[PDB]
Amino acid sequence: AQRRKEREELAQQYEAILRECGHGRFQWTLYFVLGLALMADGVEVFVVGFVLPSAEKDMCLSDSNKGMLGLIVYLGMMVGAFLWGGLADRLGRRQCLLISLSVNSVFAFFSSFVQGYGTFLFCRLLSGVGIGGSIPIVFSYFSEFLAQEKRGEHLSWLCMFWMIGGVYAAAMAWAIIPHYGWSFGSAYQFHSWRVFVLVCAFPSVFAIGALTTQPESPRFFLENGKHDEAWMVLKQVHDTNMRAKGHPERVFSVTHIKTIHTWYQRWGVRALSLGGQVWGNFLSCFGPEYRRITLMMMGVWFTMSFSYYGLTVWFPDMIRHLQAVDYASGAYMVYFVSFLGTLAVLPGNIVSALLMDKIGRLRMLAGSSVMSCVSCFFLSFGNSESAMIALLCLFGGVSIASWNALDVLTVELYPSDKRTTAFGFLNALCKLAAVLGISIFTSFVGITKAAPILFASAALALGSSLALKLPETRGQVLQ
Numbered sequence: 001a002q003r004r005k006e007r008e009e010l011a012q013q014y015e016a017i018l019r020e021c022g023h024g025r026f027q028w029t030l031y032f033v034l035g036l037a038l039m040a041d042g043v044e045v046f047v048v049g050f051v052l053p054s055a056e057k058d059m060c061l062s063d064s065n066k067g068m069l070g071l072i073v074y075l076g077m078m079v080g081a082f083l084w085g086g087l088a089d090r091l092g093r094r095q096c097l098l099i100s101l102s103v104n105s106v107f108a109f110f111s112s113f114v115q116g117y118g119t120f121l122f123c124r125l126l127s128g129v130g131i132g133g134s135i136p137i138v139f140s141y142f143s144e145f146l147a148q149e150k151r152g153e154h155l156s157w158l159c160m161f162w163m164i165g166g167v168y169a170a171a172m173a174w175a176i177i178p179h180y181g182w183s184f185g186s187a188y189q190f191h192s193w194r195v196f197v198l199v200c201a202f203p204s205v206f207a208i209g210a211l212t213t214q215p216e217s218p219r220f221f222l223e224n225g226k227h228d229e230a231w232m233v234l235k236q237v238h239d240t241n242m243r244a245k246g247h248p249e250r251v252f253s254v255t256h257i258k259t260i261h262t263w264y265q266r267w268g269v270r271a272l273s274l275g276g277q278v279w280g281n282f283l284s285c286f287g288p289e290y291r292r293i294t295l296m297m298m299g300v301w302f303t304m305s306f307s308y309y310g311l312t313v314w315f316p317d318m319i320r321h322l323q324a325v326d327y328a329s330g331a332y333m334v335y336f337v338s339f340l341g342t343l344a345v346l347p348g349n350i351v352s353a354l355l356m357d358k359i360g361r362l363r364m365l366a367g368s369s370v371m372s373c374v375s376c377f378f379l380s381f382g383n384s385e386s387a388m389i390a391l392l393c394l395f396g397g398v399s400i401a402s403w404n405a406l407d408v409l410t411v412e413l414y415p416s417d418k419r420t421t422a423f424g425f426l427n428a429l430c431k432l433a434a435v436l437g438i439s440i441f442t443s444f445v446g447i448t449k450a451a452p453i454l455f456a457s458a459a460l461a462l463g464s465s466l467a468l469k470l471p472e473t474r475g476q477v478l479q
C-alpha cells in the first residue's frame with residue numbers, strides 16, 4: 001500500500017522532471033547509440049536465418065546435422081533474452097547491455113578462428129546468448145528518457161536500425177562469401193567465412209564503444225534508492241538539451257526527487273539472491289494484477305512472431321519455385337529482397353510514428369494486424385516473382401506498425417522495476433515462436449502454396465482478435 005503510493009509519486013515527479021528537461025540532442029544521441037546494438041541484433045538474426053542454413057550445404061554434414069546451427073543458436077537467443085531481461089531489473093540497463101554486448105562480441109570474434117563444426121556451434125550459441133538480451137534492454141532504456149507526449153513516436157523509429165543490420169549482414173554475405181564453400185581451405189583470403197564472421201562483429205564493437213559514453217537510466221537509480229546519481233544524470237540531460245538549443249543560461253531547478261527504499265561462498269550467496277529476485281520478478285507478472293495482460297501479450301507476440309518467421313522461410317522457397325517454373329518453360333536475391341523490405345517498412349514507420357500518440361496504441365495494433373492478415377492472404381494470389389516481391393513489400397509495410405505499437409504497449413504496460421523482466425520473457429517467447437515457425441514451414445516445402453498462407457493468415461487473425469482486449473496506455477505516466 002505504501003510502496004504503491006511512493007511509486008505513483010515517483011512516476012508523476014519523474015514525468016514532470018522529463019518535461020522540464022525536454023527532448024533534443026541527448027535523446028537523439030542515445031537513439032543512435034542504442035540503434036547500434038539493435039543493428040547488431042539484426043545482423044545476428046540474419047546470420048542465423050540465412051547464412052548458416054546455406055553454409056550447411058557447403059559444410060558437408062549428416063542428415064542429423066541439418067537444422068542444428070539455427071535451432072541451437074535460436075535457443076541460446078531465447079535463453080539470453082530472459083537472462084539479461086531479468087538481470088537488467090537488478091543490475092541496471094546499461095550494465096547488463098554492456099555485459100551482453102561484450103559476450104556477443106567476444107564469442108563472435110572467437111568463432112572466426114575455430115577449426116571445427118562443434119566448436120563453431122558452441123561459439124555461435126554463446127554469441128546468440130549474448131545478443132538475445134539487446135531488444136528488451138534497449139527499448140526500456142530508451143523509453144525511460146522519453147516524456148509521455150511523444151514517447152511512442154520516438155520509440156517507433158527504433159526498428160530501422162534492426163532493418164539496417166539485416167541489410168548490412170545480407171550485403172556482407174553477398175560480397176565476402178558469394179556462392180563459396182564454407183569449410184573448416186578458406187585461409188582467411190578476404191573471401192572467407194572467417195572474414196565474414198569478423199566483419200559481422202563490427203556493429204557490436206561499435207555499440208559497446210558508443211554505450212561506454214552514455215549514462216545509466218535515472219529511473220533505475222530512483223527505483224533503487226540512488227538519488228544523487230539520478231539527479232546528476234537528469235542534470236546532464238537538461239544541460240545538454242539546453243546548451244544544444246542555445247539556452248546555456250537555464251538552470252536545472254530540481255532539488256529533491258522521490259526515491260524508493262571464502263570468495264566463492266560470497267559469490268554463491270550473492271548469485272542466489274540475484275536469482276531469487278529475478279524469479280520473484282518473473283512470478284509477479286502472473287499475479288492478479290498482471291496475469292490477464294501477460295497472457296494476452298504472450299498470445300499476440302507469439303502469433304505475430306510465428307507468422308512472420310514462417311513467411312520469412314516460405315517466401316524464398318516460393319521465389320525459387322517460380323524461377324524454376326519459368327526456367328523450365330541466391331545470396332544477391334536475399335540481399336535485394338531485404339533492401340526492398342527495408343525501403344517498404346519506411347512508410348509504415350512514418351505512419352506509425354505520426355499516428356501512435358494521436359489515435360492510440362490499441363487502434364494502431366488492431367488495424368495493422370487486420371491489414372497484415374489481409375496481405376498475408378493476398379500473398380497466395382501472386383503468380384510471378386515481381387508480383388510476389390510487391391505483395392511481400394506491402395505486407396511488411398502494413399505489418400511493421402503492429403510491431404511498433406506492441407513494443408510501445410510492452411514498454412508502457414509494466415512497472416519500471418519489472419519492465420525488462422516482462423519484456424525479456426516476451427522476447428524469449430518470440431524467439432520460441434520464430435523457432436516453431438521456421439521448423440513447421442520448412443516441412444511445407446513439398447506440399448503446396450495455399451496451405452502455409454492460410455495457416456499464417458489464421459495465426460494473424462487470432463493475434464488480431466487477441467489484440468482487442470488489451471488496455472489503452474495513451475496519456476498515462478510511465479509506470
Ligand SMILES: COc1ccccc1NC(=O)C[C@@H](C)Cc1cc(C)cc(C)c1
Pocket residue numbers: 042043045046049162163164165166167311312315334337338339340341342344389392393395396397
Ligand atoms: C531487413 O531484412 C532483414 C532484417 C533482419 C533479419 C533478416 C532480414 N531479411 C529477411 O528476413 C529476408 C526478407 C524475408 C526480408 C523481408 C521481409 C518483409 C516483411 C518484406 C520484404 C520485402 C522482405
Ligand SMILES: Cc1cnccc1CN1C[C@@H](c2cc(F)c(F)c(F)c2)CC1=O
Pocket residue numbers: 135158159162163308341345395396397399400401403407
Ligand atoms: C525491432 C524489433 C522490436 N521488437 C521486437 C522485435 C523486433 C525485431 N523484429 C522486427 C519484426 C519485423 C516485422 C515486420 F512486419 C517486418 F516487415 C520486418 F521486416 C520485421 C520481426 C522481428 O523479430
